[PDB]
Amino acid sequence: KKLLKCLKCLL
Amino acid sequence: KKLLKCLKCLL
């Protein structure tokens, strides 16, 4: 939903 | 996290 959130979610 | 959830989350 946001870029830093995406990184946190994927990792 | 899961594929159908991703679709729902993106759209």
Residue numbers in the entry:
A (entry chain A), B (entry chain B): 102 to 112
What do the authors of the reporting publication say about this deposited model?
Herein we report that optimization of bp3 by sequence and residue chirality variations followed by structural studies led us to the first X-ray crystal structure of an AMPB in the form of bp65. The structure of bp65 features an α-helical fold essentially identical to that of the corresponding linear peptide ln65 but comprising a bicyclic helix staple. In all four individually resolved homochiral bicyclic structures, the peptides were present in almost perfectly superimposable conformations featuring nine of the eleven residues forming two full turns of a right-handed α-helix including the pair of stapling cysteines (ESI†). The two N-terminal residues and the N-terminal toluoyl double staple formed a turn conformation. In all four cases the α-helical fold resulted in an amphiphilic arrangement of hydrophobic and cationic residues corresponding to the helix-wheel model and explaining the membrane disruptive activities discussed above. Remarkably, the ten crystallographically non-equivalent stapled bicyclic α-helices observed in the X-ray structures of the homochiral rac-bp65 and bp70, and the mixed chirality bp71·LecB complex were essentially superimposable, with RMSD < 0.6 Å for the peptide backbones. In the case of bp65, bp71 and Fln65 the peptides were aggregated in bundles of four of more helices via hydrophobic contacts between leucine side chains.
Herein we report the first X-ray crystal structures of mixed chirality α-helices in short peptides comprising only natural residues as the example of a stapled bicyclic and a linear membrane disruptive amphiphilic antimicrobial peptide (AMP) containing seven l- and four d-residues, as complexes of fucosylated analogs with the bacterial lectin LecB. The mixed chirality α-helices are superimposable onto the homochiral α-helices and form under similar conditions as shown by CD spectra and MD simulations but non-hemolytic and resistant to proteolysis. To get a direct insight into the structure of AMBP bp65/bp69 and their linear analogs ln65/ln69, we performed several crystallization studies using either the compounds themselves or their racemates to be crystallized as pure compounds, or their fucosylated derivatives of both mirror image peptides as complexes with the P. aeruginosa lectin LecB. While previous reports of similar mixed chirality AMPs concluded on either unordered conformations or helical conformations appearing in a membrane environment based on deconvolution of FTIR spectra, here we reported X-ray crystallographic evidence of short mixed chirality helices consisting of only natural residues existing as helix bundles within the protein environment of a lectin and almost perfectly superimposable with their parent homochiral α-helices. These direct observations unequivocally demonstrate that the α-helical fold with only natural residues can sometimes tolerate multiple stereochemical inversions without significant conformational changes.
